Amino acid sequence: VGACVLCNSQTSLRCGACIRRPFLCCKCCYDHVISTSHKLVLSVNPYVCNAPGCDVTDVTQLYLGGMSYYCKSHKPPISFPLCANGQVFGLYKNTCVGSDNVTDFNAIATCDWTNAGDYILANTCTERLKLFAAETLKATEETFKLSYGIATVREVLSDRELHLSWEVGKPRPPLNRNYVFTGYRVTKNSKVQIGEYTFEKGAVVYRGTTTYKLNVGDYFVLTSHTVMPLSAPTLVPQEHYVRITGLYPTLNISDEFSSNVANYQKVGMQKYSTLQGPPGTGKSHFAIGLALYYPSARIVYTACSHAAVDALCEKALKYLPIDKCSRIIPAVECFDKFKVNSTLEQYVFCTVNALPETTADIVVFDEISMATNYDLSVVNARLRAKHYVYIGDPAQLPAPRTLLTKGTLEPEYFNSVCRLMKTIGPDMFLGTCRRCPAEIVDTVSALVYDNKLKAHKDKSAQCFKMFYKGVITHDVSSAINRPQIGVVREFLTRNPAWRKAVFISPYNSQNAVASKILGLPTQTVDSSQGSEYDYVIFTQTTETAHSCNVNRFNVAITRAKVGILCIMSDRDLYDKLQFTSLEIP
Ligand SMILES: [Zn+2]
Ligand SMILES: [Zn+2]
Ligand SMILES: [Zn+2]
């Protein structure tokens, strides 16, 4: 017994072909079963034929006879069809409203999440269907991980390098950082975890959390977890106030945070607020200074990733009383300078999926581009706050969507917060980039910030661009452009001071090749988000949709504090680079 995801009419019916088994009222359930392939209906019991050795589960072919369900062949003389009168039979039949169109639900219920239009629909449908979509998507993503074959340690060639044997008949997952495995130790009659691991083409290079002397027989699977059902909306109802509500500003602030005072007051004058903070504009500084501006307020700092929460902890360690802070960790090495798992402390730092059920004066949700609607709903389910502040940048990278193959996901569809920020605009905008040379700031300001992002630094004269297609090779799931790496090598010989640079590319296999040929530390754009370096050398590698993505390209070039060299494949983005052009030797 539950509530119909389209009507909220009370019902005893859940669609049993939908992987999330959502409640559907007599009408909506009927309109759903008759217009799709979904025919299994679940009640207090399942609408299935109770005959001995019968296979009929289709609700339109079943009858309630006695107090059992039967198909036409096995029904008793007295019975009535379960699925008739434009309605499916179950409890609470009289209270039932129906919907004019079941079209959005059916599409969410039946899609395979490989078309961009699936995520577009999932972020523009009714709020209740946003929750059903976010569950259905995340369950589908978790199930797809089970499709991958087990990888088994066949030979330990060295330390940090292995030799894997793969399960027959199942595909192999890509070997990049977006796929984290878990080892398992072979035992008497079961298995135990041995940490979480990542792999890369060698043999295979493995970068695991904890070191071991792992030997043959150990194996790796992308660890899955149970997806819980959602209840809270992705955003609470907005409320605007005429005075600061539930918060008491300090009367003495320092000139370190004075630039944020007006925004801090805005935070107290509405129920939720959105803060767009481009690279290097002071997002964590903003978030910690909020605590100092409202020194009595209890604040929960949250984000999806442990690294994002830790970075808030590192900023709070600099400005806030360590005794008033606590890092929540469920039973990976994270921040360990606060007391652990103290929910009732004034400042709580905790990832979304480990959040306790509690209240707070302010909730700060950081790196919001990386959130999904599932995360948005979970936060609202766990935390009841006077104020919610969503901090991030819809021009930076989103959570990877593994199932998506047809079409690109635009920032307004990353999640509900990003949609608001791209349609009505963010409540607050951090307009001055303190990190990057002006050539880089001017580029991304025009590229993704509607010319609103201003530079703090001057031009460095150390931002260069080269147009060089090179030669693209592919391995199992990545791309390599050795001629672009050769161009960088020739550049380094003539400019050896650039050997303090970090090498960045959109592809892990490109980085592996560059690490060996150049010796520079390497980062994928996606892994570099949130970090900064004095000098960056970037090879676009290809012109794909992946390597030309403007959020990825924005993140890539905004890692640099002083200088950057971009070897570009795409003529488009090359022409957009307000960098000094260099010639190919
Ligand atoms: Zn309904
Ligand atoms: Zn269904
Ligand atoms: Zn039967």
Author numbering: 2 to 203, 208 to 336, 340 to 593
Could you pull the original sentences from the published paper?
The SARS-CoV-2 Non-structural protein 13 (NSP13) has been identified as a target for anti-virals due to its high sequence conservation and essential role in viral replication. NSP13 is a 67 kDa protein that belongs to the helicase superfamily 1B, it utilizes the energy of nucleotide triphosphate hydrolysis to catalyze the unwinding of double-stranded DNA or RNA in a 5′ to 3′ direction. NSP13 contains 5 domains, a N-terminal Zinc binding domain (ZBD) that coordinates 3 structural Zinc ions, a helical “stalk” domain, a beta-barrel 1B domain and two “RecA like” helicase subdomains 1 A and 2 A that contain the residues responsible for nucleotide binding and hydrolysis. A long 30 amino acid linker that does not adopt any secondary structure links the 1B to the 1A and 2A RecA-like core helicase domains. The nucleotide binding site is situated in a cleft between the 1A and 2A domains with specific contacts to the nucleotide provided by conserved helicase motifs I, II, and III in the 1A domain and IV, V, and VI in the 2A domain.
We have determined the crystal structures of full-length SARS-CoV-2 NSP13 (residues 1-601) in three different forms that represent different conformations of the ATPase catalytic cycle. A phosphate-bound form was determined with the same crystal form but diffracted to significantly higher resolution (1.9 Å). In the phosphate bound structure the two phosphates bind in essentially equivalent positions to the α and γ phosphates from binding mode B, although very slight shifts are observed for the equivalent of the γ-phosphate which probably represents the expected binding poise for the hydrolyzed phosphate product. More directly related to the nucleotide status is the relative conformations adopted by the 1A and 2A domains which shifts by around 20° and adopts a closed conformation the Mg2+ AMP-PNP bound crystals structure, and a more open conformation in the APO, Phosphate bound and other AMP-PNP bound chains. The phosphate-bound NSP13 crystals show robust crystallization behavior and routinely diffract to around 2.0 Å resolution, sufficient for the reliable identification of binders. We have utilized the robust crystallization and high-resolution diffraction of the phosphate bound crystals to perform crystallographic fragment screening on NSP13. We have determined the crystal structure of SARS-CoV-2 NSP13 in APO, phosphate-bound, and nucleotide bound states. These structures are of good quality and the crystals diffract to significantly higher resolution than previous structures of related NSP13 proteins and are thus a good starting point for virtual ligand screening.
